Design a protein around this ligand. Structure first.
Ligand code: 4WI
Ligand code: 4WI
Lengths: 301, 302
């Protein structure tokens, strides 16, 4: 029993972290085979960040302007190219700790583990949901850029995120491992806003199932709902509409507890219309939307 | 910015996790140098667990009755011994992935990272606080026994916890790496209760500093209080009394924010007296006590 926000073990990702310096800007790089991946803004001075022309900045940099360090050993850069908002530095040595890996683009609502790093040294590990407005609610300080988000399938590391900036609201933004930003963001020090955020409905349902598995039953009843009626109500509370694909993804949790998905939808509709009446669910006073059905299945089975 | 429940990177501990099997019971072991540490109930059947006489069960086991597997590498058990609730299995090979380490016994209020394992394989990492009643609010399924808790100081792993059992309330209990239970529990399948729990006051104050650092200032007021006046209110709401040692540990956060500890105590006193009125702090509708002053400084400065 118990239900906790849990990250994947970070070991295979720790063996890939390196320190990348260019002039007086130092950030983290991801060393996979003989290529180190990092945010391209490592080539910027504090001034350049206001309105950079990255092509003009990169032209002024030679391979010897990049100082890459793996622990205490310097890795010689023998080639360099820019792919969207990431820099790829070809190095003279292939990382012997390179695990099996793939680069993936995650979808809104999906979760990943973040290995927060400083000067190429892993510092912490936590779990994030990619918000519907393409922001994450992380914990990042100066020098944390180049820190990566990932998931693990048995022995394969799927890299889905690299950290680049923090928005005015305090939320965080970054790219996939091909340098393409998630969301309408640019790597420039200018005021940028994210869209209005919405609650991940399928994730709240997954969390209501984790609660029933753990013994919380006060919010259950024999009422039901059509998918359309639930959607008409949920969208008044800024919740995303539930689709058949979402219902299908909740199937294994529904089977495990014996509670039909549309019955849990009726309980959620009631929780939104009535509030929690001074009660808690899994020791929480708010409904939680940062656990996917997969996160609940992995912890409750 | 940001304040998240953060675990230590687990790689150093992942390299020490092994599968230990004795008969039909299988759980996790911690492989450091030529020794494997694991809960002693690995020598029990399900029936034995109801009322075990560990000494009579241990006497029936030989070195070859313990199957230890590191990945696919089978290790050879060349010695065995019981120390309190832990079994030590001497093996014929020193773990080359053994990090620099030490075994500590943590105090109530302190936090640690848990690497949850099943069949000797790491599954997930999370952060727990040792409650004042010596329980932890973890997440553990069958076969998780042997999973360990720890902290990391630069390159040295301080192992402080080994997982053994779950209480009827759904909370978790276990031992230090010497086999000594944290709390008044025994490794036997019989109804056992923990003491009444209390709120870790110093951790609530640390988390209030984390909130101000992050922009949350609505709860700040222009009042101050004394240590004694705060403690009269604390005892009424089942909060631990604040000591000078705890005030001294809040010093760095106090210096970073420019808010005196007794100015933050006045905000806490008002949150307890008036309640939170449905408002949130750091995205929480309830006061959080599972972050130490050390977890806050580590995350909000460096
Ligand atoms: C990477 N090392 C940092 C991570 C930041 C530092 C504070 N917390 C974080 O997550 N990245 C940056 O400093 C980037 C970098 C220039 C400025 N910047 C920002 O994150 C700024 N944000 C923005 O300009 C905004 F709002 F658009 F996201 C900052 C105000 C410093 C937080 C460049 C090249 C974008
Ligand atoms: C070790 N792999 C499990 C971990 C348990 C499984 C469910 N959640 C956990 O943390 N430990 C056990 O199975 C131990 C073990 C026998 C029974 N047991 C228990 O945890 C039971 N609890 C108790 O007996 C109690 F209340 F006293 F703590 C159980 C009811 C199965 C949860 C022994 C030898 C204590």
């Amino acid at each position: 029993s118990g239900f906790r926000k849990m990250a994947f073990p970070s070991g295979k990702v720790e063996g890939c972290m390196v320190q990348v310096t260019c002039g007086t800007t130092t950030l983290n790089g991801l060393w996979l085979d003989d290529v180190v991946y990092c945010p391209r803004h490592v080539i910027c001075t504090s001034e350049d960040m206001l309105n950079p022309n990255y092509e003009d900045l990169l032209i002024r940099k030679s391979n010897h302007n990049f100082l890459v360090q793996a622990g205490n050993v310097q890795l010689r850069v023998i080639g360099h190219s820019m792919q969207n908002c990431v820099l790829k530095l070809k190095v003279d040595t292939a990382n012997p700790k390179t695990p099996k890996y793939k680069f993936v683009r995650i979808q809104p609502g999906q979760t990943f583990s973040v290995l927060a790093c400083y000067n190429g040294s892993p510092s912490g590990v936590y779990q994030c949901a990619m918000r519907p407005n393409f922001t994450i609610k992380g914990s990042f300080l100066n020098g944390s850029c180049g820190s990566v988000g990932f998931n693990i399938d048995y022995d394969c590391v799927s890299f889905c995120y690299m950290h680049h900036m923090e928005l005015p609201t305090g939320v965080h933004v970054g790219t996939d491992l091909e340098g393409n930003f998630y969301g309408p963001f640019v790597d420039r020090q200018t005021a940028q806003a994210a869209g209005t955020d919405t609650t991940i409905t399928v994730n709240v349902l997954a969390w209501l199932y984790a609660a029933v598995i753990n013994g919380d039953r006060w919010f259950l009843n024999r009422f039901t709902t059509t998918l359309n009626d639930f959607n008409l109500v949920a969208m008044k509370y800024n919740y995303e509409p539930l689709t058949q694909d979402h219902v299908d993804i909740l199937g294994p949790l529904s089977a495990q507890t014996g509670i039909a998905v549309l019955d849990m939808c009726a309980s959620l509709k009631e929780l939104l219309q009535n509030g929690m009446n001074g009660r808690t669910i899994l020791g929480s006073a708010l409904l939680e939307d940062e656990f996917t059905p997969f996160d609940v299945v992995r912890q409750c089975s």
